[PDB]
Design a binder for this molecule. Structure first.
Ligand SMILES: CCCCCCCCCCCCCC(=O)O[C@H](COC(=O)CCCCCCCCCC)COP(=O)(O)OCC[N+](C)(C)C
Ligand SMILES: CCCCCCCCCCCCCC(=O)O[C@H](COC(=O)CCCCCCCCCC)COP(=O)(O)OCC[N+](C)(C)C
Ligand SMILES: CCCCCCCCCCCCCC(=O)O[C@H](COC(=O)CCCCCCCCCC)COP(=O)(O)OCC[N+](C)(C)C
Ligand SMILES: CCCCCCCCCCCCCC(=O)O[C@H](COC(=O)CCCCCCCCCC)COP(=O)(O)OCC[N+](C)(C)C
Ligand SMILES: *[C@@H]1O[C@H](CO)[C@@H](O[C@@H]2O[C@H](CO)[C@@H](O[C@@H]3O[C@H](CO)[C@@H](O)[C@H](O)[C@@H]3O)[C@H](O)[C@H]2NC(C)=O)[C@H](O)[C@H]1NC(C)=O
Lengths: 60, 432, 84, 119, 53
């Protein structure tokens, strides 16, 4: 879904009676360059690959 | 509800209950005054096959379907008065009956309960009517009547029923309910999704599946203890147990690169044979449990595709549908064939009714305009070894579009070098 | 409808591919050298000849040849990894 | 006040899981859920712990009442227990398990119990 | 995965819990395995590796 729904994202599946607010508790930048590489391989270079394979082969 | 005018003199039902689907045949001999047959409602949206023979021929009279609903039999030449003819009819349902002690335990026989009507249902005057019931090894009747003339009598691992000389024109107000003994997992998929990639530059076809299977059997009374299952594995003398541990689909002739993945990873307990492929789940399925997985492989194109005779740009493909486990019943299964890029379609046919047909597009690797031609079509309620068939697609594929792939890559590289040429030779100094 | 196709299926002959599948890893490495030579000499002549017309001329021609060998290079080089 | 780590040690302060364990270690909730069917597994009624290197006898683990086992993996590495839903008649879930589990101790025992006032 | 032979009995019981359990159901384990249960078994834990509260 969108990038606007990620900067302010309240998930209720962790610390259950009182869920955590993610956007003020994590460091973005490892996720958004990865969504950028996914968006560039899928639309411009022509080859669609899964998000799991972009996440595994992100360090080498 | 229109009837007609006919008259039959014999009627021989024989329900066979030996798999995860109930299969019966009748042998009738209809005499003189196009032919209708009648179904109880509720057993009309479970019918999965229909047929008609002549008693000595090898042909097949055509027949189709459409609160008692009907089915139509035609005749090849004509019909004449004061003349009789004998025919048989096979049929395959999608019912099994429900386990009668709902909570069996671990290692016991399980019993099934199934209920239908005792007298014939057909809309014509019956002279003699028998009823036989082959299959399992232990039968009993549930809530018997009081009248002696229509109890059943057993012999030779089967039932028998009375000859019953006179039956009126239309009456089905009497039921029965049998409990029989069964020992099998009796599983069914909930839906399937198979898709077939038909690359053409290199030869190979490759197949993928997505099975969502479940088990309909008797639940456990008390939990799930491990060590009692270790005691079953330690002392083994039978295959009569009702949970599934291995399962094996049958494959085409020369299959090459197998894999058995999963939704959480890649399960590594699977080895091939000359033609089979034995797989094992992560956990044994015990009767209310689910398992969703994925199998795929690859073959060669040179036995699934024939180029037309008097041409070189017309091809005919014939694809097998539904090659899987040996005894399972599919509720809804949808097929999807991916023809290569820039092809056109003329005609499509299959020997089984095909609820819907659609034609769309879908992009793939190194595919830079308009996608593969995808054509998808759906089925419903069809069984393992009785509805296998083929499917035939005819298409054309010119020599023009065969060579457009490397020219598409080459045009993107050529339009990528000119940006470096213009970007490199361009003045950006601020001094003189 | 089904019978015309079914008797038209057995009346035909089999399928002969254009290049067999076990040959393509020779054309892959036999293409990857030539495209690097031609394209390297293409980007090598973008230096200071100080002659604009002949530089655009030579660069355009060697870019055309390098493109049309890079296409066949990546098509044969993709079928021998396992993505068709 | 409720929990103290002076009680999980044995006499003269040693931490162990054997037949001479503590009285409040044997009744805890993470002891009963790990060594549940472990002595009935091996032959003869004795078992080795393979990490703590201690020996367990099938009188050392009492049964639990409020939970029940649902899945237990192949090499006994993950064990999954489920909370048992509450009793439909107000009875404490220890008393119904003691009633079912022990069909002995039959008696007449005509004596009036000691109850508070119904308010 | 924990290796002369394999020991894969740590992904059986997350995929059991994904297949055979209703979708709004709480799992209570110790805080070392909070991220894997939420990531691979897909349920709603009570603690995880953050140790925030
Ligand atoms: C000298 C000054 C130099 C400035 C350098 C600026 C370089 C930034 C270029 C970023 C280009 C983004 C292109 C883009 O739109 O890709 C998107 C969105 O992709 C992303 O999620 C990552 C982009 C996030 C932008 C971060 C804020 C801007 C940071 C640099 C100013 C794909 O993400 P998606 O998750 O697919 O969807 C995003 C939302 N949509 C509206 C698009 C549906
Ligand atoms: C955060 C980075 C974003 C920068 C965006 C612009 C990118 C420019 C890239 C320049 C590439 C290097 C080539 C270059 O040298 O040009 C710079 C270029 O000098 C400059 O920096 C001026 C660029 C800005 C032009 C002014 C317009 C305002 C831009 C919109 C905000 C000028 O320096 P020179 O003219 O080369 O210095 C003297 C000449 N020597 C031979 C001695 C070298
Ligand atoms: C000069 C050459 C030009 C560049 C060469 C192009 C390389 C081709 C690979 C393109 C990307 C493929 C990514 C990929 O997902 O491949 C994996 C299978 O995984 C693999 O086998 C990919 C290994 C690729 C090795 C790459 C070596 C380094 C190349 C960098 C220049 C297959 O996964 P799936 O996509 O699931 O395959 C089955 C699905 N079908 C639709 C095909 C039925
Ligand atoms: C910028 C530099 C980056 C370099 C990164 C170096 C990475 C090293 C590790 C690469 C991983 C190996 C990828 C791989 O799995 O390749 C193997 C075996 O593949 C082959 O058979 C070799 C074919 C090589 C063809 C040459 C391609 C050159 C162009 C690539 C840029 C696949 O072969 P198989 O697994 O046997 O698949 C069988 C498919 N058949 C059709 C053959 C039946
Ligand atoms: C694994 O396979 C099963 C079997 O198809 C998939 O289950 C499907 O989805 C739900 C459960 O997620 C099943 O139950 C349904 O639940 C909804 C709740 O909104 C309810 O309204 C329905 O009436 C129904 O009870 C459903 O039967 C089932 N099949 C479908 C939709 O065809 C499951 O999604 C698969 N994947 C997993 C577990 O990751």
């Amino acid at each position: 879904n969108s990038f606007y729904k990620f900067l302010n994202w309240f998930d209720d599946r962790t610390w259950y009676p009182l869920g955590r607010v993610t956007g003020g508790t994590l460091y973005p930048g490892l996720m958004t360059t990865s969504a950028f590489i996914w968006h560039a391989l899928r639309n411009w270079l022509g080859l669609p690959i899964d998000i799991r394979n972009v996440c595994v082969l992100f360090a080498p | 509800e229109p009837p007609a005018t006919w008259e039959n003199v014999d009627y021989k039902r024989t329900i066979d209950v030996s798999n995860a689907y109930i299969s019966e045949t009748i042998e009738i001999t209809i005499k003189n005054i196009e032919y209708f047959t009648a179904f109880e409602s509720g057993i009309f949206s479970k019918v999965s096959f229909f047929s008609a023979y002549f008693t000595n021929e090898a042909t097949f009279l055509n027949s189709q379907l459409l609160e008692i609903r009907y089915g139509i039999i035609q005749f090849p030449n004509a019909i004449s008065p004061q003349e009789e003819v004998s025919l048989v009819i096979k049929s395959f349902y999608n019912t099994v009956g429900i386990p009668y002690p709902e909570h069996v335990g671990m290692s016991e026989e399980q019993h099934l309960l199934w209920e239908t009507n005792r007298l014939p249902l057909s809309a014509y005057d019956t002279k003699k009517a028998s009823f036989t019931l082959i299959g399992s090894s232990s039968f009993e009747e549930y809530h018997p009547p009081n009248d002696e003339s229509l109890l059943g009598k057993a012999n030779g691992n089967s039932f028998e029923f009375g000859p019953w000389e006179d039956i009126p024109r239309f009456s089905s107000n009497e039921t029965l309910a049998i409990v029989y003994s069964h020992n099998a997992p009796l599983n069914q998929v909930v839906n399937l999704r198979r898709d077939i990639w038909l690359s053409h530059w290199a030869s190979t076809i490759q197949f993928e599946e997505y099975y969502e299977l479940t088990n309909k059997a008797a639940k456990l009374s008390k939990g799930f203890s491990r060590l009692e299952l270790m005691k079953q594995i330690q002392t083994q003398n039978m295959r009569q147990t009702h949970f599934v541990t291995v399962l094996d689909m049958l494959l085409p002739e020369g299959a090459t690169d197998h894999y058995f993945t999963d939704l959480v990873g890649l399960v590594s307990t699977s080895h091939a044979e000359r033609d089979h492929f034995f797989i094992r789940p992560r956990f044994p399925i015990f009767g209310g449990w689910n398992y969703n997985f994925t199998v795929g492989w690859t073959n060669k194109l040179s036995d699934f595709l024939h180029v037309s005779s008097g041409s070189d740009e017309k091809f005919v493909a014939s694809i097998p549908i539904l090659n899987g486990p040996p005894d399972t019943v599919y509720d809804n299964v949808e097929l999807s064939v991916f023809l290569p890029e820039g092809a056109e379609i003329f005609d499509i046919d299959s020997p089984v009714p095909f609820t819907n047909v659609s034609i769309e597009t879908q992009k793939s690797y190194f595919d830079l305009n308009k996608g593969h031609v995808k054509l998808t079509f759906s089925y419903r309620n069809l069984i393992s070894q009785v509805a296998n068939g083929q499917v035939l697609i005819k298409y054309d594929y010119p020599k023009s579009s065969f060579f457009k792939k490397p020219l598409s890559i080459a045009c993107y590289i050529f339009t990528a070098l000119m940006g470096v040429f213009v970007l490199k030779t361009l003045n950006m100094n601020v001094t003189n | 409808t089904y019978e015309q196709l079914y008797k038209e299926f057995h009346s035909s002959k089999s399928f002969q591919p254009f290049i067999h599948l076990d040959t393509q890893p020779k054309f892959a490495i036999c293409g990857l050298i030539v495209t690097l030579a031609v394209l390297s000499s293409a980007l090598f002549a973008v230096g200071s000849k100080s002659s604009y017309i002949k530089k655009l001329f030579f660069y355009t021609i060697l870019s055309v040849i390098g493109s049309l060998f890079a296409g066949l290079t990546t098509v044969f080089a993709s079928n021998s990894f396992g993505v068709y | 006040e409720e929990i103290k780590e002076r009680d999980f040690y044995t006499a003269e302060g040693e931490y162990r899981v054997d037949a001479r364990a503590s009285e409040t270690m044997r009744n805890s909730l993470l002891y009963k859920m790990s060594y549940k069917d472990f002595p009935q597994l091996f032959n003869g009624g004795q078992a080795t712990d393979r990490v703590r290197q201690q020996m367990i006898t099938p009188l050392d683990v009492p049964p639990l009442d409020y939970f029940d086992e649902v899945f237990t993996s192949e090499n006994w590495m993950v064990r999954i227990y489920q909370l048992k839903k509450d009793d439909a008649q107000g009875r404490t879930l220890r008393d119904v398990g003691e009633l079912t589990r022990s069909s002995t101790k039959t008696r007449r025992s005509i004596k009036r119990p000691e109850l508070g006032l119904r308010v | 995965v924990l290796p002369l032979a394999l020991i894969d009995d740590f992904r059986e019981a997350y995929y059991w819990l994904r297949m055979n359990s209703d979708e709004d159901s709480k799992v209570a384990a110790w805080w070392d395995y909070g991220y894997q249960i939420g990531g691979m078994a897909d349920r709603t834990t009570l603690v995880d590796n953050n140790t925030w509260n």
